[PDB]
């Protein structure tokens, strides 16, 4: 196309637009999984603290 605007240029934008939601979803999934295992182990004895620990 142009030397300033080549044809391979939207590849980096598509990779960034994917990688944002990908790595934030991995972080949110680890946080939700670890905290949910903690809540389900805790709230067998104290079910009244269930909606406080959310």
């Amino acid at each position: 196309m142009t030397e300033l605007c080549p044809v391979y240029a939207p590849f980096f934008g598509a990779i960034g637009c994917a990688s944002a939601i990908i790595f934030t979803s991995l972080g949110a999934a680890y946080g939700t999984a670890k905290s949910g295992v903690g809540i389900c182990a805790t709230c067998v004895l104290r079910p009244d603290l269930l909606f406080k620990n959310i």
Binding site: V37, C40, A41, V44
Partner: protein, 369 residues
């Protein structure tokens, strides 16, 4: 207390040593002692069918059902069964029961596989329902001469139909025999059924003879013992032919454990409903739903619930059946318990049945209730 079989083919091996291939000239070889009148009684199992309509007349299992017809010690319990059979074989009512179980005597691959995985699972449940039913008649108060071999025959018959379900499902899935004879040879190992008399039938359609170690003649015998007596056929108003075939009918129905008040009409059909007047009377309808709960909540709950009911203790069923199993949780082993949650409405209905008759439990194991 009522049955004790064996498998010793070497104690009386003289009857099976030589190549005896004739039904005639075998009673002299079956004497073998100074006893004559009681050695003819063990020969009476195969003697009315010893000449008419059979192939080769001595199959290799027809002697072991005649050798182990042990009348040497006791000659009373089998004679009472022989006085009752062929006295039961006179009415058409037994004969019309012996004609209902008989004839006259792509996406289509997912469907045909599912029709035969259903066949392998229904017959695998119903085979297990007779294994925990041959230890209910082991309890005190029952009997084992008529109850045991009647339902050992059915558990062999459901093991073959369950094997034909998934052998056929394998050869249809791997395509779209010799395996059925390998499992037929396998189920004749170990124990073997006790000897019941022959149940010959003679009428205008011919002279027939069934076997009673076939699962289809057993299945038609219990359909005959079902319904209650009527106002006729047991009164002395009709001494014609009834009291020798009705008192023979009631002495087997009592021999299972069913009183003559108990009706027990079967259910299987191609129709919607059955009738109006032979319905169960809501005390046993509530109780039959409690037994079906005990069959399908555990593999081991039907025997200690009948055992708890013969003692009149059928209100403590919720507590005498509870046991604890472990469970890996997120906090460790917890050891929770499994209890049959019988409601109070169907815990009361198990009291008004004093003891479950063995005929009621065998209709339940066949899906007829």
């Amino acid at each position: 207390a009522s049955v004790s079989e064996g498998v010793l083919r070497k104690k009386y091996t003289k009857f099976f040593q030589e190549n005896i291939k004739t039904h005639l000239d075998l009673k002299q070889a079956l004497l073998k002692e100074e006893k004559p009148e009681t050695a003819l009684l063990a020969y009476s199992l195969v003697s009315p069918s010893g000449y008419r309509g059979e192939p080769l007349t001595e199959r290799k299992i027809l002697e072991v059902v005649s050798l182990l017809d042990e009348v040497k010690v006791d000659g009373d319990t089998y004679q009472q069964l022989k006085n009752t059979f062929d006295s039961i074989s006179k009415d058409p009512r037994m004969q019309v029961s012996l004609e209902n179980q008989y004839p006259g005597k792509g996406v289509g691959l997912l469907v045909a596989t599912g029709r035969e995985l259903h066949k392998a699972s229904v017959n695998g449940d119903a085979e297990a329902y007779h294994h925990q039913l041959e230890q209910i008649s082991q309890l005190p108060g029952r009997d084992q001469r008529l109850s045991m071999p009647m339902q050992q025959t059915l558990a062999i018959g459901h093991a073959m139909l369950s094997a034909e379900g998934a052998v056929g499902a394998t050869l249809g899935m791997a395509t779209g025999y010799g395996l059925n004879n390998e499992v037929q040879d396998q189920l004749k190992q170990g124990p073997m059924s006790g000897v019941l008399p022959r149940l010959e039938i003679s009428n205008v359609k011919g002279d027939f003879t069934f076997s009673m170690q076939e699962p289809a003649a057993v299945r038609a015998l219990m359909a005959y013992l079902g319904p209650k007596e009527d106002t006729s056929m047991s009164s002395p108003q009709a001494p014609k032919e009834a009291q020798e075939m009705e008192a023979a009918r009631l002495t087997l129905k009592q021999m299972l454990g069913s009183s003559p008040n108990e009706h027990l009409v079967p259910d299987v059909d191609s129709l919607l409903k059955l009738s109006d007047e032979d319905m169960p009377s809501q005390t046993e309808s509530t109780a039959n739903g409690a037994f079906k709960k005990l069959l399908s909540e555990d593999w081991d709950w039907l025997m200690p619930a009948v055992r708890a009911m013969d003692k009149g203790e059928a209100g403590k069923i919720n507590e005498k059946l509870t046991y604890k199993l472990p469970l890996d949780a997120a906090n460790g082993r917890v050891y929770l318990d499994k209890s049959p949650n019988l409601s109070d409405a169907q815990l009361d209905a198990l009291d008004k049945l004093g003891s479950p008759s063995q005929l009621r439990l065998m209709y339940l194991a066949e899906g007829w209730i």
